[PDB]
């Protein structure tokens, strides 16, 4: 029982110890392509890189590297693509991957500037009259509409392949108040954001993997993937007791290093799943209570 374990770690104060065991048992696979010289300026941070066995390959001839990782959960039947914050020179790469892997949703859990520094390039247009044209990957990106909530923003983006003239709709889910190495204001404000992504159909298996990124793509990103997956197992197995959060996190660290960055991010992951477990079991009123407590209307 997660609650019996959760209560047990809060009374023992061993959250920094449980998390430090996870970093110890975490997988360690070669990042040969990442640490190549030609891909130095494609890596935002030096301690964050994709495993060669799970990295996303770009379908071009020149240089196929982009700091992105396919995380596939076979049992849970869902895949995610986690990636760093696009650098000013890999923005075309970022959208080239989105197209090739046939993705419909992007989830951005950081701001372009946080704590006085630049954590991410402005890889999407802010005004409908100002569309972005990436000439390196021959793409065009245009802003269609945006619904601005208090702590998150849902944009609607049209991406066009200039070579073939195909166009696709891309939903952009921007969580704006999740600080680096911090946690959401409340589990309700997080879950209300997760389900807003679910109902949009971006996570549907008829589409590609969803793209989830923050600044490095492991801290806030893994927390979002860890909660969704765990909830997903809990509706399939129908046996919530069987869901071990510590194991599921270790499974994801096979596909991308450093998933979850702080011990309290791990703590929040428990609370998020414990609260979200109420909807999986059938509670229909908790769908709106999250909406009310999140205070999105503003």
């Amino acid at each position: 029982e997660m609650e019996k374990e959760f209560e047990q770690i809060d009374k023992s104060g061993s959250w920094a110890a449980i998390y430090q065991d996870i970093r110890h048992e975490a997988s360690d696979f070669p990042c040969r392509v990442a640490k190549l010289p030609k891909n130095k300026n494609r890596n935002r941070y030096r301690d964050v890189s994709p495993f060669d066995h799970s990295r996303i390959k770009l379908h071009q001839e020149d240089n196929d590297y982009i700091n992105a990782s396919l995380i596939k959960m076979e049992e849970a039947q869902r895949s995610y693509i986690l990636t760093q914050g696009p650098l000013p020179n890999t923005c075309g790469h970022f959208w080239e991957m989105v197209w090739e892997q046939k993705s419909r949703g992007v989830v951005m859990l950081n701001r372009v500037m946080e704590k006085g520094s630049l954590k991410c390039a402005q890889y999407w247009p802010q005004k409908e009259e100002k569309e972005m044209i990436f000439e390196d990957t021959n793409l065009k990106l245009t802003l269609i509409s945006e619904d601005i909530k208090s702590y998150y923003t849902v944009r609607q983006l049209e991406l066009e392949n200039l070579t073939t003239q195909e166009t696709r709709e891309i939903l952009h889910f921007h969580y704006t108040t999740w600080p680096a190495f911090g946690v959401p204001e409340s589990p309700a404000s997080f879950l209300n954001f997760l389900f807003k992504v679910r109902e949009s159909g971006s996570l549907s298996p008829e589409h590609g993997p969803v793209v989830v990124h923050a600044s490095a793509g492991i801290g806030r990103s893994g927390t979002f993937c860890l909660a969704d997956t765990c909830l997903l197992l809990m509706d399939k197995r129908k046996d919530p007791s069987s869901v071990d959060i510590k194991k599921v996190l270790l499974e994801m660290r096979k596909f991308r290093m450093g998933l979850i960055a702080t011990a309290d991010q791990l703590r929040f992951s428990y609370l998020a799943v414990i609260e979200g477990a109420k909807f999986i079991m059938g509670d229909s009123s908790v769908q709106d209570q999250w909406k009310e407590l999140s205070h999105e209307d503003l």
């Binding site: 935002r44 941070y45 030096r46 301690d47 964050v48 600044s215 490095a216 492991i218 801290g219 960055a261």
Partner: peptide, 4 residues
């Protein structure tokens, strides 16, 4: 730069 370094993430940690």
């Amino acid at each position: 730069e370094y993430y940690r």
